[PDB]
């Protein structure tokens, strides 16, 4: 049926089957394709049925920016750009045929000087910098949804969503990879990654940093052959709670690719930007700089 514009992933594995999503431009704009493989026996279909998705929302046409599938409860969550550039997140059930608008993603990105986490109420001020989504993500262990782009959004239910003040709007998200254990890695088009823990809310910068520079020079006088002054971040991913990165090196006589660890615990343990305090002890002044962890041991 052709004119396929995009492949979209389904990370989960349910019903003894694997799933993929095909988005098509040119024709069948209001329609998508779901491909299900049952143990190597493959099939594909055109799920949005007879009616185009443009029947049940304003605008005229519909463009499927991104879609995702949930094998549990037979769900499809997909975001549609409408002809006036507005992005609406609409849910769909395959067992019974509804689509329902579940979010009207607001534009003109707000401000939060100190509101580190911001519940997206209605009475919120807005700034001139707009919003631009490029996709979503589902973490199906705690049953939650992420919205990436120029900004991050999350929720457990499907009623309200939370905006995080730390991540700027001057950097656009390349992608986001997952631990499926609570660790989010978010890569940007600036070739910078941001590490976020599901328990907290703050998004911690990693790769241009004090800790990273200290780690890099430490490896350099460790004289290993996995660290080079010139590098290309070919890819990065997760495995058993550890961040791997596939990096190529153009070093003379060492123009080689390899995968290496990115230990973020050490990386933000070497973050010397921190409070310091000077006390007097034995008629001498010592930097007995403060302890920020609430406890001593666990």
């Amino acid at each position: 049926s052709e004119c396929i514009k995009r492949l979209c992933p389904v990370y989960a594995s349910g019903n003894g089957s694997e799933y993929v999503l095909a988005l098509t431009t040119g024709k069948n704009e209001g329609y998508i394709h779901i491909g299900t493989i049952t143990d190597g026996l493959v099939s594909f279909e055109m799920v949005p049925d007879g009616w185009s998705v443009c029947e049940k929302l304003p605008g005229k046409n519909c463009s499927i920016d991104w879609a995702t599938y949930i094998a549990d409860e037979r769900n499809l969550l997909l975001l549609v750009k409408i002809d006036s550039g507005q992005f609406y997140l609409v849910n769909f059930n395959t067992e019974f045929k509804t689509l329902n608008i579940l979010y009207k993603i607001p534009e003109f990105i707000p401000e939060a000087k100190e509101l580190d986490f911001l519940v997206l109420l209605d009475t919120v001020t807005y700034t001139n910098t707009p919003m631009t989504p490029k996709g979503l993500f589902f973490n199906t262990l705690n049953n939650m949804l992420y919205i990436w782009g120029n900004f991050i959004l999350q929720s457990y239910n499907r009623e309200e969503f939370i905006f995080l003040a730390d991540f700027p709007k001057e950097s656009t998200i390349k992608y986001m990879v997952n631990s499926f254990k609570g660790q989010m890695a978010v890569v940007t088009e600036n070739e910078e990654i941001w590490y976020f823990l599901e328990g907290g809310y703050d998004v911690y910068q990693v790769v241009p940093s004090q800790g990273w520079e200290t780690y890099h020079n430490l490896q350099k006088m460790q004289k290993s052959s996995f660290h080079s002054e010139d590098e290309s971040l070919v890819s990065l991913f997760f495995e058993d709670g550890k961040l791997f990165q596939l990096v190529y090196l153009f070093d003379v006589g060492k123009e080689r690719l390899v995968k290496r660890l990115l230990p973020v615990g050490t990386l933000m343990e070497y973050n010397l930007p921190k409070p310091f305090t000077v006390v007097n002890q034995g008629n001498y002044q010592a930097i007995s700089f403060t302890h920020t962890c609430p406890f001593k041991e666990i």
Binding site: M221, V278, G282, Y284, Q285, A286, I287, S288, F289
Partner: peptide
């Protein structure tokens, strides 16, 4: 004990140490 005879200028030696007593600063 770390040896780097080329990369830093004026410094060739270093020791990686761990603080038990936090050292005294100048008045």
């Amino acid at each position: 004990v770390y040896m780097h005879k080329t990369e830093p200028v004026g410094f060739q030696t270093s020791i990686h140490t761990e603080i038990i007593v936090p050292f005294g600063i100048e008045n």
